[PDB]
Design a protein around this ligand. Structure first.
Ligand SMILES: *[C@@H]1O[C@H](CO)[C@@H](O[C@@H]2O[C@H](CO)[C@@H](O[C@@H]3O[C@H](CO[C@H]4O[C@H](CO)[C@@H](O)[C@H](O[C@H]5O[C@H](CO)[C@@H](O)[C@H](O)[C@@H]5O[C@H]5O[C@H](CO)[C@@H](O)[C@H](O)[C@@H]5O)[C@@H]4O)[C@@H](O)[C@H](O[C@H]4O[C@H](CO)[C@@H](O)[C@H](O)[C@@H]4O[C@H]4O[C@H](CO)[C@@H](O)[C@H](O)[C@@H]4O)[C@@H]3O)[C@H](O)[C@H]2NC(C)=O)[C@H](O)[C@H]1NC(C)=O
Ligand SMILES: O=C(c1cnc(N[C@H]2Cc3cc(Cl)cc(Cl)c3C2)nc1)N1CCC12COC2
Ligand SMILES: [Ca+2]
Ligand SMILES: [Ca+2]
Ligand SMILES: [K+]
Ligand code: NA
Ligand SMILES: [Zn+2]
Length: 799
């Protein structure tokens, strides 16, 4: 009913209720603007720049922007007014000067935040395009910057923007791709069209809602595509001239570039220079505009991207029609990832298992890998949403997957795309923070975009909604407004059992072929005399209610669960000088009762014998025993964990070859290893009643994954066990699978495939925390914020 008027309502902040016509920055996208929105709100006359001949003009309200004497008080000068007309310098030409305190006009309650978001802005543009982005380069060198910022998977636009807004993984906020089917709604979300505007898609609590609920006003973050960038900037600057009670504190600008051009020309196409220059000019308009309003040393500015851009061409397409015969029985969500479901829920013939097998290791250079979603690397956090299809294809960088060839030429055109694994270098994007609350001329390590919501909340004095950030992990970006987290309280205290059972009380079906001076010696070991060597950062805290025992040994310490009948964690240190040994022949099948732990709270060997699929391994490796006599400890029933034979090939190579390799490279390592149970693929520790698989005929639960946390000194001139300073960590969460179908070269020696598997399943310590309910690094000499940053670190193994 577009017969209302936008008079005095241009870019109004409260969108008004149909069937009244709209005047807000999204009205165009809903074809809902008042009849006079273009005439009143999208003025273009005379362009965007003051010229010497306009200086002091008589106000003409038709002009896009003003060069009249009254313009600063009206808040609608062209951004270069003071430069052209009052002998001022452009912001970019001014020296960098530290902003120690906010320098704001009277009536400003808090420094505003402006988020300048750029689509497709790959991390390496900051160096490669530096010659043509002076304004961006100044923000970067004068403020706080990371070398790169890691997006979420899939590295598509809307999943990443909404992660920036919420602090949530896509599985949690519900925007899991740029297209989706929700079976509960029976409804589809797409880029083109109207369903995507329905609020039921968008979960969690985005920043503008967090602000509004807590009494902080927000500019609307979404801009209709036809609103020119110059008008977006002028609109933000006009909002910043509103009266105190009406003026927002948080704003977002968005640019569709350089993504738009990158899809057409590739990430480094010669055509990409111009888009980067134009974005830089837009940054210059904002900063000049702020300087005119005396806000350039008041506002915090974030310059942030959603994802990068890779070289991708029509010819690098894999076709499912080359693998499946049944291609017409499937629906594929295609491109830089694949998602497969049945075309018809009425076809009881459709079988996921046969589709996976037809797609598994079928061609020698296959450029995609199929996964059941629960088997994807846990670091992707891409499974716990009904909108994510059970079958997933992880597509190699530089490739696409499509159903049939005709999908690719009845839809070559494009040279860039994005969407791949969020570890891929080409997908990485940018972060710069500039302002009073950010640090001065500071470089920070790369971090994940899920962390920024918390920081944006800190910048605005908001309490964040519950999210997947680790609040405090990015305190090192900030001068002020830091978040002083406290360590979580331990919920369960350990028991410390001594010797309480005789050997003959155990009827576990286990067998094992097994002085006065050093009788005392091994008593001391069982009492924890070496514990300072093997437990370097304190005992992990158990953050849930359970029954567990601390068990000391010469070579390792463990926290042994009476409920799960195995360790929650096993901690050991391997020095650079440590020697690897074999398992002696007489000890091959040795398993020994632990006289500290009751038979009723022990595993038993007969279950493993009876279970024809399931074998066992050990958490502390027998290969790394300090002495023949200490080795006996490694065969305790309390150190045993269930392992499929296929997995034991992985585990044995880790333990026998790789731990020593890491100790020699890193100058000793401390290893914490353990099981993980995540049968409902939610990324969170399972309770006992969630476990779907036990060792046959027993109560021994089968892990879904095995973790290790491998810590050393960041200054590798110091040994892991005498480190005075910051730590270095790498971790993994390996899937506990009955086959090695994930690894196409698994018929070869482990030296050819195991380490590449482990790299794909790299993890953060925080990922393991979620999955175990344990809290690590509780007793270090480091600040808690520093430890939070360490727990969020991901070792990516990119070149
Ligand atoms: C990343 O950070 C996020 C945020 O902190 C973490 O997610 C939280 O995890 C908690 C545990 O999984 C979860 O708590 C549950 O929430 C239920 C209430 O849910 C609604 O209310 C909140 C508050 O406003 C809201 O945010 C929720 O939003 C979800 O759902 C809507 C769709 O309806 C979406 O729009 C939105 O995108 C979001 O979806 C995501 O989460 C849901 C689960 O809530 C998933 O199913 C989706 O796939 C998607 O990931 C909701 O609108 C509450 O009812 C639960 O309480 C039950 O659960 C346990 C027992 O299981 C018990 O304590 C209770 O007694 C109760 O049991 C009864 O219900 C059971 C389940 O039906 C039933 O089986 C029993 O038999 C009983 O009847 C529970 O508290 C919290 O909602 C989410 N929040 C978000 C935003 O996702 C996430 O874990 C972090 N990730 C990692 C890896 O760390
Ligand atoms: O595509 C976009 C679009 C527009 N405006 C924006 N603005 C960004 C700025 C920002 C910053 C953060 Cl921190 C977080 C979020 Cl969610 C956002 C949204 N994004 C996309 N438009 C809206 C109409 C269409 C064309 O297809 C849909
Ligand atoms: Ca994008
Ligand atoms: Ca779980
Ligand atoms: K067996
Ligand atoms: Na294989
Ligand atoms: Zn794109």
């Amino acid at each position: 009913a577009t017969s209302g008027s936008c008079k005095g309502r241009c870019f109004e902040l409260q969108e008004v209720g149909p069937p009244d016509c709209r005047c807000d920055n999204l009205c165009k996208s809903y074809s809902s603007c008042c009849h006079d929105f273009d005439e009143l709100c999208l003025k273009t006359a005379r362009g965007w720049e003051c010229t010497k001949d306009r200086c002091g003009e008589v106000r003409n309200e038709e002009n896009a922007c003003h060069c009249s004497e009254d313009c600063l008080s009206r808040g609608d000068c062209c951004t270069n007014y003071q430069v052209v007309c009052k002998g001022e310098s452009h912001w970019v030409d001014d020296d960098c000067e530290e902003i120690k305190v906010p320098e704001c006009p009277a009536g400003f309650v808090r420094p505003p935040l402006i988020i300048f978001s750029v689509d497709g802005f790959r991390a390496s543009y900051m160096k490669k395009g530096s010659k043509v982005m002076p304004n961006i380069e100044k923000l970067r060198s004068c403020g706080t910057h990371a070398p790169y910022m890691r997006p979420v998977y899939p590295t598509k636009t809307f999943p990443n923007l909404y992660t920036l807004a919420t602090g949530l993984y896509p599985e949690s906020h519900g925007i899991v791709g740029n297209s989706m089917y929700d079976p509960v709604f029976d409804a589809s979300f797409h880029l083109r069209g109207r369903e995507k505007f329905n609020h039921r898609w968008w979960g969690g609590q985005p920043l503008w809602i967090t602000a509004t609920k807590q009494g902080v006003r927000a500019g609307t973050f979404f801009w209709s595509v036809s609103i020119p960038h110059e008008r977006r900037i002028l609109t933000i600057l006009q909002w910043l001239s509103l009266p105190d009670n009406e003026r927002p504190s948080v704003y977002a600008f968005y640019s569709e570039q350089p993504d738009f051009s990158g899809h057409k020309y590739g990430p480094f196409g010669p055509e990409m220079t111009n888009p980067l220059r134009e974005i830089d000019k837009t940054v210059g308009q904002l900063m000049d505009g702020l300087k005119q309003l005396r806000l350039h040393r008041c506002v915090n500015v974030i310059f942030v991207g959603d994802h990068g851009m890779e070289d991708v061409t029509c010819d690098r397409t894999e076709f499912l029609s080359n693998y499946l015969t049944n291609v017409d029985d499937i629906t594929l969500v295609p491109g830089t990832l694949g998602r497969i479901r049945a075309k018809s829920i009425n076809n009881s013939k459709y079988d996921p298992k046969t589709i996976i097998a037809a797609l598994t290791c079928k061609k020698p250079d296959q450029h995609f890998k199929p996964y059941m979603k629960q088997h994807l690397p846990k670091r992707l956090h891409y499974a716990n949403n009904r909108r994510i299809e059970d079958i997933h294809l992880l597509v190699d960088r530089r490739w696409h997957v499509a159903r049939k060839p005709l999908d690719v030429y009845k839809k070559c055109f494009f040279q860039g795309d994005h969407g791949f694994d969020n570890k891929v270098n080409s997908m990485q994007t940018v972060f710069v923070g500039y302002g009073p609350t950010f640090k001065y001329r500071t470089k920070v390590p790369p971090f994940e975009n899920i962390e920024l919501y918390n920081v944006m909340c800190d910048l605005l004095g908001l309490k964040p909604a519950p999210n997947n950030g680790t609040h405090g992990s990015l305190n090192h970006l900030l001068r002020t407004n830091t978040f002083r987290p406290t360590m979580p309280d331990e919920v369960s205290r350990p028991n410390y059992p001594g010797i309480m059972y005789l050997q003959s009380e155990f009827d576990l079906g286990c067998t094992c072929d097994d002085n006065k001076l050093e009788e005392l010696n091994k008593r001391l070991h069982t009492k924890g005399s070496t514990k300072e060597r093997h437990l370097l950062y304190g005992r992990p805290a158990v953050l849930y209610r359970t029954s567990y025992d601390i068990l000391y040994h010469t070579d390792f310490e463990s926290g042994y669960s009476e409920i799960f009948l195995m360790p929650l964690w096993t901690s050991y240190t391997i020095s650079k000088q440590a020697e690897v040994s074999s398992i002696p022949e007489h000890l091959t099948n040795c398993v020994r009762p632990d006289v500290r732990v009751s038979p009723g709270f022990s595993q038993n060997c007969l279950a493993y014998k009876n279970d024809k699929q399931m074998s066992y391994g050990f958490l502390f490796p027998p290969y790394l025993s300090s002495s023949p006599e200490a080795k006996y400890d490694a065969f305790l029933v309390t150190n045993m964990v269930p392992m499929y034979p296929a997995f034991k090939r992985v585990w044995a190579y880790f333990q026998r070859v790789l731990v020593k390799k890491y100790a020699s490279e890193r100058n000793g390592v401390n290893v914490i290893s353990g099981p993980i149970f995540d049968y409902n693929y939610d990324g969170l520790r399972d309770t006992e009643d969630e476990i779907k698989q036990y060792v046959e005929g027993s109560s021994i639960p089968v892990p879904t994954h095995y973790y290790s946390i491998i810590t050393s000194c960041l200054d590798f001139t110091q040994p892991a066990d005498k480190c005075d300073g910051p730590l270095s960590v790498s971790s993994f969460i390996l899937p506990h699978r009955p086959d090695n179908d994930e690894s196409c070269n698994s018929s070869e020696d482990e030296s050819k495939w195991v380490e590449e598997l482990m790299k794909m399943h790299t993890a953060r310590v925080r990922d393991i925390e979620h999955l175990t309910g344990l809290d690590f690094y509780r007793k270090t000499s480091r600040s808690y914020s520093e430890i939070l940053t360490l727990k969020t670190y991901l070792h990516t193994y990119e070149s």
